[PDB]
Symmetry: D3
Subunit: 244 residues, 6 copies
Amino acid sequence: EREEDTVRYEIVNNVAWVYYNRPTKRNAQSPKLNRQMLKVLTELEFRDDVGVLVLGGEGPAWCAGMDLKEYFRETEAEGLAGTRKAQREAYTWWERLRWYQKPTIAMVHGWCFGGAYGPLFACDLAFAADEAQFGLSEVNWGILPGGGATKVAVDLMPMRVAMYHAMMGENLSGQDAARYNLVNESMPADQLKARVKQVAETLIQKNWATVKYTKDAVRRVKEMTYDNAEDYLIRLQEGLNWFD
Amino acid sequence: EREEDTVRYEIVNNVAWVYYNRPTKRNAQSPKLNRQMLKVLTELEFRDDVGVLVLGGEGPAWCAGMDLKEYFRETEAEGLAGTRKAQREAYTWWERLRWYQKPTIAMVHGWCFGGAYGPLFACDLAFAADEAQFGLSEVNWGILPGGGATKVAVDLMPMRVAMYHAMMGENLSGQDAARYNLVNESMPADQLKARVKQVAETLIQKNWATVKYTKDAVRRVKEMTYDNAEDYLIRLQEGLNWFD
Amino acid sequence: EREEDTVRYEIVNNVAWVYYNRPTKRNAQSPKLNRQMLKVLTELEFRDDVGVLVLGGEGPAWCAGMDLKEYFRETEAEGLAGTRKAQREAYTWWERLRWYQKPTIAMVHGWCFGGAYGPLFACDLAFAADEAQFGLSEVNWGILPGGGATKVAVDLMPMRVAMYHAMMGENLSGQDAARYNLVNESMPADQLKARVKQVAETLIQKNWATVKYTKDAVRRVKEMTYDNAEDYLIRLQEGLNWFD
Amino acid sequence: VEREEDTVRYEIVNNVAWVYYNRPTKRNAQSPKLNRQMLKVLTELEFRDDVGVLVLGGEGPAWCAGMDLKEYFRETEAEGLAGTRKAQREAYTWWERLRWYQKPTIAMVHGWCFGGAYGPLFACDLAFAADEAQFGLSEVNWGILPGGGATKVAVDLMPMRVAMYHAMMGENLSGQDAARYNLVNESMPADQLKARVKQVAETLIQKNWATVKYTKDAVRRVKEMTYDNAEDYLIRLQEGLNWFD
Amino acid sequence: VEREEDTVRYEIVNNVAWVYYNRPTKRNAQSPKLNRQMLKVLTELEFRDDVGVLVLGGEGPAWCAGMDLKEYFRETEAEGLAGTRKAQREAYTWWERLRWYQKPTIAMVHGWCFGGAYGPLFACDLAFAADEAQFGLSEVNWGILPGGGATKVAVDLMPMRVAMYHAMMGENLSGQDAARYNLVNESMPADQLKARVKQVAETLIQKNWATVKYTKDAVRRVKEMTYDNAEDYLIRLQEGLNWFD
Amino acid sequence: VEREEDTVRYEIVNNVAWVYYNRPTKRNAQSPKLNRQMLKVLTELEFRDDVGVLVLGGEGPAWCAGMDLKEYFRETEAEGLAGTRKAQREAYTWWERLRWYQKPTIAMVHGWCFGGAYGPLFACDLAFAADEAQFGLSEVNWGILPGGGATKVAVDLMPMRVAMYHAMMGENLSGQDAARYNLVNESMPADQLKARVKQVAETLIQKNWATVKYTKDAVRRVKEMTYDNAEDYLIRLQEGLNWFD
C-alpha cells in the first residue's frame, strides 16, 4: 500500500539495519520499494553516526526478486517509457548500494531469488542462514535472470557452477552458497544476527575512510590488468591520504 | 579407417548422444574425426527434435587428446598448409560446440587429456566418473598444452591450480576435477549415465530458446565489465522476446 | 646492518634456495633487502645450472611485509624522490620474480603479511605450513594493502573472500590459504621442506624452456579473451619451437 | 540563472526538441540548479511519441563555459562530502541520460565550450560547431584536472597527441580545428549553423526512430569491444530491433 | 551470378593473385553462392608458394554493393533459423579467412562499396579507392543495422564522430573522403588505381613474405592489447618469426 | 659513442632539461652504453626541484636511427639469452622511465627517427618535428618486426590503415605527414623548431607542475579504460592531486 512502508530501518551503535518491508509479498522489489530504498540509502549514506549498513528482510524471505505484478506486468502496460522508468529505479539503487560510502553487509535468512542477486552483489559481504535458499528460477518462466543476476553469478561463483545455476534454475542452500562463494559464510539461522552484528561492530572500530577505499579497491581491480592495478592502488592511497 | 566411423550418435527422447568412436586409439582427435564431428554437430544442431546434446566416448577413454600420428606428425609432412588445415578442422568444431544452439553436456567416464580440454570447455556442463582422469601431460613431451587447454584451465580453475596443472603435468581425479570446478560433479562410473540422462531430460522440458540465451549469457558476461554486462543482458532479453 | 646480508642462498641439485635473511625483523622488506634481492635474482636467473628457484625465509616469519622504519617512514623523510626510489626497488624485484626465466616456488612456513603478497603472487607455485598465517592487516593501521596485495587477493581468491580479507584484516591459516587457492597446498611444518624439494626436483627433470613458456602462458591468458588466447597460445608454441 | 525552472528552456518544432542551456549572463555554466532542471527536462522529453531528435544549444554567446565554480564547486564542499557527492551525481546523471538517450542527439555549439561542457558534448551523438566557437580544457591553468570526464572525452574523440596537448597546454581549438580533430562533425560560419542542424534533425526524423537508436547505441558500444565480440553483439542487437519494431 | 563457380574469378600474375567478385550485373552483391565460392578460392590460393599478395577487386561498376537481399536475406529465413545461421556462417567465415590471410591483402575499390562489403574491406590489410568510388552504410534507410559487422569496421577505422554520422545518416563518402577519414589508405583518379595497386603488390612480393605476415598480424592484434601487454607480445612474435624463417 | 658517459649530454636552462642523444656519427643509435647512460641521466633529473620540463633532442643530423645493430643486437646474443635479456631490459626500462616521467616531456625531432626510436618518441608527452625530419619502420626490409614496441606506438598514435601501410611497406613519413597522421603534434621548418619547443617548455614551467603531471598521466591511462571506469578514475586522480599540492 504505502510507498514509505516498503522499507524499514533502525540505527543501533552506529549500524544502519535496513530491512525490505513487504513480508507478505516475500519482499519482492516493486517500483514503490525501489523508490523508497533509494530514498533511505541516500539519507543514511553520509551520516557521521552511520559506519556500516546491514540489508535484511522481514518475514520468511530476504528478497524473492522483482514483483511481477507491480514491476514487470503493470509497468509494461504504460509501454517503453514505463518499462524504462521502472528499470532505472531498480538499477540506480543497486548501484548506489554497490558504491556505498559505508561498508555494506547482506544478512540473508531465507529466499534470495532472481533480481535479489543485484542487491546481494551490491553488499560487500554476505552472511546466510543454512536454511536460506539462493536461485535463478527465471529459466523455468522462459526469461533471462533478472537485474544482471547472470553477471553476479559469473563474478562470484566458478564458471561451471554459474552455468548450472542459470541453466537448471535449482536452488543453492546456505552451505552451498558459502562453498561456491556467493556469500562469505553460512550458519544456523539462530546464530546469523549475532555473527552479522559482530562483523558490523568490528568494521565501525576501523578508520571508516580506509574501509571505503579498501572495499572500492577490491571491486575495481577485478576489472584491471595486474600492471594497471598496481599503479591504480598507489593513486588510491594518494587520495586516501587527502580524505584523512 | 573410415572417416564416417570416427563418430557415432543416437537420438533418444530428444537427446543427441554423440560419442567419439575410436575406442582402440583412446578417442584421439584425428583429422578424420575432426571433419566427421563437425559434420555430425552441424546436422544435429537445428533439428526441432534435438533439445540437448551429450558428448561421450566409446571404450576406456573419453578423449586422450590429439592423435599425434595423424594430426601433429603426418600433417606437418605437407608443411604450413597441412598444419593450418588440420588446426582449423579441430578449432572450428570446438567453436561450433561452444556456441551450440542446444545445451551441451560432457559425460566424462575416463581419460580426458590435452586437446580434449577444448571440447570439455565447449560443453556447457560436465559430469565425470570418480575414475576419470584429467591431465595436461604436454609439459612432459616438451610442448605447450594442446588446443587452448591453458586458457580452459585458467577460465574454469583457480589460477594456482591451473598453474600446477600445466607445469607439473599430473592428473586430477574425477573428485579433484569437481572440487576445482573443471566439471560440475563427479560420481561413481555406474551412476554417471543416469545422472547425465536426468540432467538432459530436465533441460528439454524448459523453453529451448531461453536455455540457449541463458547459457550464451554466462559465457559472454565473463568477458565484460559489470556495467557493460548489465546493458548487454537487457539487449539479450529483447532478442529472446523476438525468438519466442 | 649490511645490505649484502639481507638475502642468503644455496644451489643444491640445480635448485636455488633463496631466503629472506632479516630473521630478527620478521624478514620485513627494507630498501637494502629490496636492492639485494634484485641483485641475487638477477645473477641466478640465466645460470645453466639453476632450473628452479625456491623463496623461503629465515626465522619464524616468511615475510611480515614492508619494513615501516626503513621503507615507509625513513624514505618519506627525503620526499617524493625518496618514496619513488624505494617504491621502484620493491616493485622491480617482484616483477623480475613474476616473469622469472626459471620456475619459482614460495615455501611459506610462517607469517606472510601485506607487501609480502607481491612476492607470494610472483612465485608460480606456493606451499604453506598449516601454522603459516596470511593477512592484510593494513586496514587496521588506516592504509591500503601494501604492494598491490589487493590485486593479488582478487586474482587468486574468490571475490567474497578477497573482500573479507582486505576489509576485516584477519589472518588465514595455512589450510584456509590452500582452501581459497592463495597457495597450492598446506601441510604440517615438518613436511613442508620435503614436499617443496620434491616439487623442485620434479620440475628440473622437465624441458626448462617448455616449463617457462607454459608458466608464462597461464599468467598471460588470464588477461585475454578466449578467442585471443587461442591465437596467442599458437604464437607461443612457434616461439618455443625456436628456443629448442 | 536564479529560479531552478528558468535555468533550461525548450521548444518542440516538427518533432525536434530544441533544448537550450538558459543562464546566458553566466555563459550557461552548469550550476546544481541547471543540473537538476536539465535532468527533469531530458527525462520528460525522452519517450514522447512526438519527439524524434533532441538539439542541445545555448542562449547568449556561450554554449557552456563548464561548471559554475560559485554554486557547483563552492556552496557544496560547504556541506562537506555529502554536498560534493550530491552535486557530482546531479551533473554525471544527466550527462549519462543524454549519452544513452532514446532519441538521436545533436550539439549545436555556436560559442564557448569549456571544461565540464565536454561531458554533454560527448553525450550528444552528433555535434556541429560555428567557426567562431572555441573549445578548451583550461583547468590546467587553474591547477585542477579537466572537469566532468573531459580527459576521456578528448581521448575517445581526438588523436592521442592532440588530446595530450589539449589537456596539458589548456589552449583553445577554433570550430575549424575541432572539426579537423573530430571533436565535432563539422564547422561552418555561425550564420549557417542553425540551418545545417535543422536539416540534419529533419533528415533523422524521416528515418525509422527505433533503427536510429539501435544504430547510434551500436557505435558507442562496439568502441569498447574486441572485433570478434562486436560481431556477435551486433547480431544480438539486430534480433532485439526485430522485436522492438 | 547463377552457377556457383562463376561468382568469383581470379588470375595469378607475377605472384599477385587478382581475385574479382564476379556478379557485375548484380553489382557484386554477396549471395550464398558467392560466399561459398569465395571461401574455396581464398582457401586454394592462401598457401601457394607462387602467391605473395592477394588483390580483391570487382567486375562491372561496383566493388561490392553488400549482401544479396534476394538470396542471402530471403530464401534463407525461408528455411528458418537453420538457413539464416548457415548463410551467416558462409559470409562471416570467408571475411575471417581474408582478415587473417597468410599473404598480404589489398582492396582495389573502383566503385560502389556498401553495407556488408565493409567486412571484406576491413579484412584487406591495405585499401586503395578511386575518387569516383562511393562508401556507405545505407541500412538505416532500410530500417536495419549495418550488415556484416560494418558498425565495428567504421569504429575501428574512422574517428568516432565520423563513424556515428556514417551509421546514423546513411550518406555516402567519396573516395577522397574515405582516404581523409582513413577508411582507405589512398584515393586517386580511377584511371590510375590499377597501376598504383600493382606497384604496391610488386613492392610487397620483393619483401620477406613471412616478415610481412607477422608484421600485418602484429598491427591487427596490438590494437586490442594494453601498451604493456603489446610490448611482451611483440617480442614473442619475433621469436616465432625466428623459427618460421 | 665509445665512453658510456659521453653517449648522452644535457643542459638545464630556466628549469628546462635539454637532453640530447650524443652518438652523432652513429646517428644516435641506441647502444647498450647509451641505454644505461640515458637511464642514469633521466633518473638524476626527474625529481630535481629546478627541472620543470624535459626536451629530448639529438646531436648531428639524426634524432635517433633506432637500435645500434652492432652493439645492441650483436655482442649480446654473443652471450646468449642472458645478454639478449639484459640489453632488452636496459632499452625498455628507460623508455618506461620517460613515458611515466614526473615532469612533462617533449620530443624535438629535427632529423631521422626510425625503428626502436618510436619507443622514446611515444614516451615523450608532446613531439614537434622539422619538415625535413623522416619517420620510418624499415625493419620489414631487414626481415624483422619493428624494434622496441614500435608497432604498438604506430597503432596508438596513427589511424589503423596508416599504421598498417607504415609497418608493411617500410616507407618514410615526412615531418608534415607525421603531423597529419598525429605521430607528432606539429611540423615546421627546421630553422623554427627549437624556438617553438622552447616556447612550449616555457609555457609548461609557468603552470602548476603537479597539475601538469596528473593531467598528462590521465590522458595516457584513460586510453586503456571504458568511459564508465575512466569517469571514476579521474575523480580518484583529482583527490590524489588535492593531497599532493
